[PDB]
């Protein structure tokens, strides 16, 4: 966002809105398509015309299914395996954000290969090299267990989302606040 | 009373109950009394097995600086200190 | 003595040790001990043998640590009972004129 | 000192300033630095024993044989307040709760 | 980042001269720090106070004069030929368009980034009445840098002598909890997302816990272990007094 | 990319890629001789499997030995000799396990516990205060004004 500088008409930037659209869909760094919908990118073009690439990639996370939107798209982007194979890399992202608390309120950290399989569109075996190769390219960082089928990951790239994550944001530091009213109370009265 | 003590040592330890072998530890002519003396004890019942679930205990008013405890087991052992250190005030 | 040493036994190898009465007779006399817990073992009726749940492995649990915070205490008992009676005398030796 | 020279001075330097640490005046310098400061409280408490057992030998018969007064209280003041600083420090590991959770 | 080292002397006489100038809650007051800035460490070893004239109600009303930092750093080459000008402090809390634009003014008598620390009259709230903070651009942007109070040898001795812990580490630290908890609800209800991707990132950091309920245990063990040898300390003692009661009982005999 | 395909490697397409392009790698006239391609085969398949134990250990932490040995295109008696070899020269240490199928990483017990690993703990608490001061300075200006 800057007002002075760049200053272009409204049909260069559309144009410069398709080269920001190609630029994430052969990588998932800084964020990911949906980094871009916050920002005055999104809101600013039209919605047809394939200007929405960014926009279904976005709901395409939490459904899961590249056949809709390859139904949406022409070959050219199509035909490149990369958009494929790091577009399964922020679905399983949603299920890796979900290790420290989304659901379960007592923080239990547990990864089941059937739920990703659902949500990335892979295979159970083929999770084992998934998450592999996320490690070699530096996307996350921590150990996997092949016989509990178990993974534990340290952090990634946490994202701006807001809502039920800054809602249980809070109910973490209560029992930071909870130990002053047990704990810290009994070693006053010492 | 000779009946409710031979069922708990079969019970509280010993898990997962059988059916005809607890009629013949408590002298039971009739298997029909057999149910009627578990639904008195509450006992979990599952598909041709009755179990035991209540092994373990809770509750039972408060306890304070005993059985295990969490916030206070550490307490005691950092009054210990302040004990040494009140003598010598 | 038996249940200490013998950690998988069979029914029938009691009664013939101690000459007991029958096999519905020890069954009975094994499940008494395990309410205080001293035998602590499981009678498996479905298999036909008792079976030790004793596996030690303890030094990892908290159990040994309550009997530490007693003896932290236990030394101190005789701490407070002695300090005070170095004192006690010497009031009437420090009273009197020494030469 | 006045009023404003009163409570900067404290605030800056009174005896030694720990502060602007404080959650980790005494986490940091202790439990996060067990790198290496007790590492190997097994030997460390084998550093105990070679200090008491010095003096301790010397004077079993409570007369005068090696000509030593303090003897007995020099191990006992300097193993006392170490031990006292083991103790306090290994309590407050687990102590400071940080919520590990799973 | 860098580091950023203050003596008390410079904080002790940076609020006597808001003192000195009558300064109310309606004006601010500002200075110039003086130090070594080329090492990572910056350090402050002289400070003075300029009188700067502020609205508040006003923020494009500041007066700030440069004719008094030319002769103030003539008259220090006479003095001390290592203290050069390494940036300014300022008094309040707020941080308004009257400090923001004076920060490229004292850029031109100071060679490296100048240093910009709030100072708090009023010192209210924990410790470090004043933070240190640098200046970056991606908006002008203030970064804070760890604020380490040291001093010479005799110069903390010298304080000494006008001034002449289990508890004190969890009272601290409960108080800092407690500041988290007020940091989450003050911040969302501004927003209604950098700070909590900071925040997010480091809440992560029994599967793998399974083998580290032990390591609990084997500390618990060495206490055990250390209060035997902690009863020694008063086993001897216990010996040390009877070594006086066989004398005790001496006196009266010869008495 | 033949460098860095060690890490990725399934050894499923190793056969395939040699055979598509081989500049080097099955027909080479060039800075070799021989009077076979043996060479070729022999010497590549042996440090493709050297090369794929390395990043396994540093990725799983245990898995388990039957779909290891089908990563490894080998048999059980293939399987036990490259690991052997790893081990007595010193290049990887894991724990194998032949009555129970459970390959591990081994991680090393010496870290004394709490004496180092605790180090992730204050870690993980550490960066609050420095975020907060960040935070105190632009908060006031942004909501203040």
Redesign the interface.
């Known amino acids: 966002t800057l007002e002075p500088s760049t200053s272009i008409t409204l049909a260069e930037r559309q144009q410069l809105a398709y080269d920001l659209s190609i630029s994430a869909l052969l990588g998932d760094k800084i964020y990911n398509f949906g980094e871009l919908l916050h920002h005055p990118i999104m809101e600013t073009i039209v919605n047809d015309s394939n200007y929405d690439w960014l926009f279904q990639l976005l709901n395409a996370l939490t459904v899961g299914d590249f056949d809709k939107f390859d139904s949406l798209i022409k070959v050219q982007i199509s035909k490149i395996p990369i958009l494929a194979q790091h577009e399964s890399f922020l679905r399983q992202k949603i299920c890796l954000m979900t ?2 608390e989304t659901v379960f309120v ?5 990864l089941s290969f059937e739920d990703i399989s659902k949500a990335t569109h892979l295979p159970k075996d083929n999770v ?2 998934l998450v ?2 996320a ?2 390219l530096g996307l996350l960082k921590g ?6 089928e ?1 993974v ?4 990634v ?4 989302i ?1 809502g039920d ?2 809602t249980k ?2 109910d ?6 909870d ?2 009213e ?3 109370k ?3 009265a ?1 | 009373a000779i009946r409710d003590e031979i069922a708990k040592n079969t019970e509280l330890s010993y898990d997962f109950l059988p059916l005809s072998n607890i009629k013949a530890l408590l002298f039971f002519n009739n298997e029909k009394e057999t149910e009627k003396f578990a639904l008195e004890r509450n006992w979990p019942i599952v598909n041709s097995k009755v179990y035991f679930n209540n092994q373990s205990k809770e509750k039972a008013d408060y306890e304070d600086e005993m059985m295990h405890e969490e916030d206070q087991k550490t307490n005691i052992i950092e009054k210990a200190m302040d004990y040494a250190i009140s003598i010598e005030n | 003595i038996i249940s200490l040493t013998y950690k998988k036994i069979s029914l029938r190898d009691i009664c013939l040790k101690l000459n007991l009465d029958s096999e519905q007779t020890v069954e009975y006399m094994v499940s008494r001990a395990i309410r205080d817990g001293v035998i602590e073992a499981k009678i498996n009726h479905e298999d036909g043998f008792i079976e030790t749940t004793e596996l030690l492995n303890i030094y990892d649990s908290e159990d040994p640590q309550q009997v530490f915070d007693e003896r932290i205490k236990f030394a101190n008992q005789l701490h407070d009972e002695y300090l005070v009676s170095m004192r006690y005398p010497e009031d009437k030796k420090t009273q009197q004129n020494e030469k | 000192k006045t009023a404003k020279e009163t409570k900067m001075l404290m605030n800056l330097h009174k005896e030694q300033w720990q502060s602007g640490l404080k959650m980790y005046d005494y986490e940091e310098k202790e439990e996060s630095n067990l790198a290496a400061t007790k590492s190997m409280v097994k030997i460390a408490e084998q550093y105990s024993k070679r200090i008491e057992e010095e003096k301790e030998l010397t004077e079993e018969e409570l007369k005068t044989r090696y000509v030593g007064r303090q003897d007995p209280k020099k191990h006992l003041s300097e193993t006392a307040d170490e031990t006292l600083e083991n103790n306090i420090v290994s309590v407050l590991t687990a102590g400071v709760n940080s919520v590990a959770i799973k | 980042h860098e580091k950023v080292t203050i003596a008390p002397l410079v904080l002790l006489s940076a609020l006597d001269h808001y003192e000195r100038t009558q300064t109310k809650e309606n004006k601010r007051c500002v200075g110039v720090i003086l130090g070594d800035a080329n090492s990572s460490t910056i350090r402050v070893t002289n400070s003075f106070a300029l009188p700067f004239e502020e609205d508040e109600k006003n923020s494009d009303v500041w007066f700030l004069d440069h004719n008094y930092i030319e002769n103030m750093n003539e008259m220090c080459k006479k003095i001390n030929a290592k203290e050069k000008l390494i940036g300014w402090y300022h008094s309040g809390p707020k941080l308004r368009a009257s400090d923001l634009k004076i920060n490229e003014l004292f850029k031109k008598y100071t060679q490296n980034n100048p240093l910009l620390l709030i100072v708090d009259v009023k010192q209210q709230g924990v410790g470090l009445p004043t933070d240190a903070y640098v200046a970056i651009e991606q908006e002008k942007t203030f970064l804070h840098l760890p604020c380490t109070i040291e001093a010479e040898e005799a110069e903390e001795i010298g304080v000494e002598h006008l001034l002449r812990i289990r508890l004190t580490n969890q009272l601290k630290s409960l108080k800092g909890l407690q500041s988290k908890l007020k940091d989450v609800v003050e911040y969302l209800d501004k927003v209604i997302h950098t700070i909590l991707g900071k925040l997010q990132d480091v809440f992560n950091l029994n599967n793998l816990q399974k083998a580290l309920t032990v390591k609990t245990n084997d500390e618990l063990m060495v206490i055990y272990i250390s209060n035997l040898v902690r009863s020694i300390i008063a086993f001897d003692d216990l010996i040390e007094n009877k070594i006086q009661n066989k004398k005790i009982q001496e006196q009266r005999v010869k008495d | 990319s033949l460098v860095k395909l060690f890490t990725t490697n399934e050894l499923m397409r190793w056969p395939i890629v040699q055979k598509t392009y081989e500049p080097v790698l099955n027909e080479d006239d060039l800075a070799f001789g021989g009077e076979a391609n043996k060479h070729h085969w022999e010497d590549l398949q042996k440090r493709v499997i050297e090369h794929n134990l390395r990043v396994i250990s540093e990725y799983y932490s245990r898995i388990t030995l039957l779909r290891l040995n089908e990563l490894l295109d080998l048999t059980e008696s293939q399987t036990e000799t490259y690991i052997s070899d790893l081990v007595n020269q010193g290049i990887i240490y894991a724990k194998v396990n032949r009555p129970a199928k459970i390959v591990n990483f081994e991680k090393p017990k010496n870290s004394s516990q709490l004496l180092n690993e605790w180090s992730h703990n204050v870690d993980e608490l550490l960066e609050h205060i420095e975020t907060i001061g960040h935070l105190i300075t632009k908060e006031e200006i942004m909501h203040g004004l």
């Open positions: 290790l420290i007592k923080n239990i950290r547990m084992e090299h592999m190769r490690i070699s150990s996997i267990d092949q016989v509990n178990l534990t990951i340290s952090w790239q946490p994202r701006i807001s994550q800054i944001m809070k973490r530091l209560v029992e930071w606040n130990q002053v047990k704990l810290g009994k070693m006053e010492r």
